[PDB]
A paper describes a structure:
Efflux pump antiporters confer drug resistance to bacteria by coupling proton import with the expulsion of antibiotics from the cytoplasm. Here, we uncover the proton-coupling mechanism of the Staphylococcus aureus efflux pump NorA by elucidating structures in various protonation states of two essential acidic residues using cryo-EM. NorA contains two essential membrane embedded acidic residues at positions Glu222 and Asp307 which are conserved across S. aureus strains and required for conferring fluoroquinolone resistance to the human pathogen methicillin-resistant S. aureus (MRSA).
To determine whether protonation at Glu222 and/or Asp307 were responsible for triggering the conformational change to the inward-occluded state, we constructed the E222Q and D307N single mutants of NorA (NorAE222Q and NorAD307N). Next, cryo-EM samples of NorAE222Q and NorAD307N in complex with FabDA1 were purified at pH 7.5, which we anticipated would induce deprotonation at Asp307 or Glu222, respectively. While some side chain density in the NorAD307N cryo-EM map was missing, it did not affect model building for residues in the substrate binding pocket. Superimposition with wild-type NorA gave backbone Cα r.m.s.d. values of 0.73 Å for NorAE222Q and 1.07 Å for NorAD307N, as well as similar interfacial contacts with CDRH3 of FabDA1. The most significant differences were observed for NorAD307N, which displayed movements of TM5 by 1–2 Å. These changes were accompanied by 0.8 to 1.7 Å longer distances between Glu222 and the backbone carbonyl of Phe140 relative to distances in the NorA and NorAE222Q,D307N structures. On the other side of the tether, the nearest distance between Asn307 (mutant) and Asn137 was 1.5 to 2.1 Å longer relative to those in the NorA and NorAE222Q,D307N structures. Hence, a disrupted interaction at one site influenced the distance at the other, an observation consistent with the two-pronged tethering model for NorA protonated at Glu222 and Asp307.
Residue numbers in the entry:
A (entry chain D): 26 to 130
B (entry chain A): 1 to 180, 193 to 382
C (entry chain C): 27 to 154
């Protein structure tokens, strides 16, 4: 189950609205997760469901689903958000990550 | 798999055997005291109410404390209930024993289901639910048979068997079991409705007929529980074997809803024939052929539920068990009430309910076509 | 609190072997599953393997089906990834994460814990 994440790169300024879509071909279950990774460190959990929010994560992040398109929304951006955000679905025992959205602030 | 799964399956097979144990020996139990059919149904009905009421509380206790302790506590309570039921003298002490057994069953079942979910791999979950349904149905069929087997030597001994088997299961569980906003909106409340209603009507009709057959035989044929249980379990094994061996041909030319609609049609016409049936061998044969349809309805219903669920097979199993208990309590009280008011009113209710299931399946098919 | 530490990595001859291990601490190993992901230099992540301690079920990715063997011993709370054949595509920074799998009882039915890779240890590096 391959998933396409669009776009690949996304430049942005501070305090804007940024959205990233990772589309799953077989989308029947909302087992979508998103990870933020900084250069030279390990990715940290950002969303662990369709629209949930893990503890210790800023409230500005949010997720949503529409049929097959999974949207991550950053309502307000800060310099900290300089990182790469990946999509992951684990509906089955197999796990497949996305391609990556390296934002450039 | 390991024997830890065998013990867990036994913990449910024995529970449902105890569920079905009362029906064969019930007529002598409540006729030597001379009790109206209302209480005869009310015994099993109160068992089912206890099970369903304690099911969520039992699951909560299993989650908050630990599955092993809840399982052994429930086996101990079930063994105590089965030992006490055979040392009863009046209606109250028997209803209390049935209630305690029901609460033990309803607080064991969630614990065993959770343990099986925690031990089984993520891919053998639909299959495990299939074995769960198969074991539950086998216990439902086989309870009365174990009752009637040694209901012959004495009328307290089958519950001695039940208590001894509960103690044995408890001692295996002690030495073998070891410990390791979109939540509710996922169900659309418009897809599971048809299988829910269908399993409800199936369980209701089956429990009602199982309750009514013993009363009818006792009040008209004046016979012993032995061949009553023999006929019930023979119909059960006939239907189960028929379906499990010829489902390859059944699935070839029939769909699911068509199968479980023509099943109700066959059951209702055979029950209409049962109205005409008034002879010993005639009533025996007609009950034997009636039970086949009720027994073969269930596998199609659980297959439909599994197909509908897809990935939420735990939810499907929980809903199926809850609504099976719903039918198993709604049936017996009304069956006893009508048997009190008239000897064929339960039969008329059964055929009407079968026709209601028929029209429900018909409207589901029409909605699917539209 | 909860931390994960990994050992191994370094220079590997092509086709050689290396035992990549993850040391667990702070969480219940038998109520969680340890998974391994791979990060190629300048590329995106990709799940490699996963083992569930509460059930003994192991899963491998299609590109890696039948070449890396995963295991986890509960006694020392360790997670093992055995490498039997390495190549150019296998060079990466390998991370080790924990996947929480514990059934919670909603009334009348058990529901699994939501899928998540909560705790990540600083991954080691495997070259060549």
């Amino acid at each position: 189950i391959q998933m396409t994440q669009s776009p690949s790169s996304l430049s942005a300024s501070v305090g804007d609205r940024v959205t990233i879509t990772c589309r799953a071909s077989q989308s029947v279950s909302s087992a979508v997760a998103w990870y933020q990774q900084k250069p030279g460190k390990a990715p940290k959990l950002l969303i662990y469901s369709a629209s949930s929010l893990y503890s210790g994560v800023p409230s500005r992040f949010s997720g949503s689903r529409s049929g097959t398109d999974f949207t991550l929304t950053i309502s307000s951006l800060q310099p900290e958000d300089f990182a790469t955000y990946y999509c992951q679905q684990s509906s089955s025992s197999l796990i497949t990550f996305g391609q990556g959205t390296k934002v450039e602030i | 798999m390991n024997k830890q799964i065998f013990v867990l399956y036994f913990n449910i097979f024995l529970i449902f055997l105890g569920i079905g144990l009362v029906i064969p020996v019930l007529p002598v139990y409540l006729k030597d005291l001379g009790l109206t059919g209302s209480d005869l149904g009310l015994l099993v009905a109160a068992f089912a109410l206890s099970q369903m009421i304690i099911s969520p509380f039992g699951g909560t206790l299993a989650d908050k404390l630990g599955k092993k302790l809840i399982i052994c506590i429930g086996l101990i309570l079930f063994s105590v209930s089965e030992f006490m039921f055979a040392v009863g003298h009046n209606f109250s002490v028997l209803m209390l024993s049935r209630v305690i057994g029901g609460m033990s069953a309803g607080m064991v079942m969630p614990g065993v289901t959770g343990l099986i979910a925690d031990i089984s791999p993520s891919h053998q979950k639909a299959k495990n639910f299939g074995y769960m349904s198969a074991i539950i149905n086998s216990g439902f069929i086989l309870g009365p048979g174990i009752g009637g087997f040694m209901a012959e030597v004495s009328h307290r001994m089958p519950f001695y068997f039940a208590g001894a088997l509960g103690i044995l299961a408890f001692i295996m569980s002690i030495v073998l079991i070891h410990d390791p906003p979109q939540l509710l909106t996922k169900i659309n409340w418009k897809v599971f409705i048809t299988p829910v209603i269908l399993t409800l009507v199936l369980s209701f009709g089956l429990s009602a007929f199982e309750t009514l057959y013993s009363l009818y035989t006792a009040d008209k044929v004046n016979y012993s529980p032995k061949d009553i249980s023999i006929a019930i379990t023979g119909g059960g094994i006939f239907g189960a074997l028929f379906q499990i061996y010829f489902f390859d041909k059944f699935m070839k030319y029939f769909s699911e809803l068509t199968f479980i609609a023509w099943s109700l049609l066959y059951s209702v016409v055979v029950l209409i024939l049962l109205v005409f049936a008034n002879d010993y061998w005639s009533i025996m044969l007609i009950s034997f052929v009636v039970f086949i349809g009720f027994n073969m309805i269930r596998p199609a219903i659980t297959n439909y539920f599994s197909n509908i669920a897809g990935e939420r097979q735990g939810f499907a199993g929980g809903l199926n068990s809850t609504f099976t208990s719903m039918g198993n309590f709604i049936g017996p009280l009304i069956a006893g009430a009508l048997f009190d008011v008239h000897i064929e009113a339960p039969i008329y209710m059964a055929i009407g309910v079968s026709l209601a299931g028929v029209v429900i399946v018909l409207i589901e098919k029409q909605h699917r076509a539209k | 609190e909860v931390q994960l530490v990994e050992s191994g990595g370094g220079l590997v001859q092509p086709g050689g072997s290396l035992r990549l291990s993850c040391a667990a601490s702070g969480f219940t190993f038998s109520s969680s599953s340890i998974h391994w992901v791979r990060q190629a230099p300048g590329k995106g992540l990709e799940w490699v393997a996963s083992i569930s301690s509460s059930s003994g079920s192991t899963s491998y990715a299609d590109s890696v089906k039948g070449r890396f063997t995963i295991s986890a011993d509960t006694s020392k709370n360790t997670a093992y990834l055995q490498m039997n054949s390495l190549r150019a595509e296998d060079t990466a920074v390998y991370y080790c994460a924990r996947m929480s799998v514990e059934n919670h009882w909603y009334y009348f039915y058990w529901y699994m814990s939501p899928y998540a890779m909560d705790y990540w240890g600083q991954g080691t590096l495997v070259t060549v």
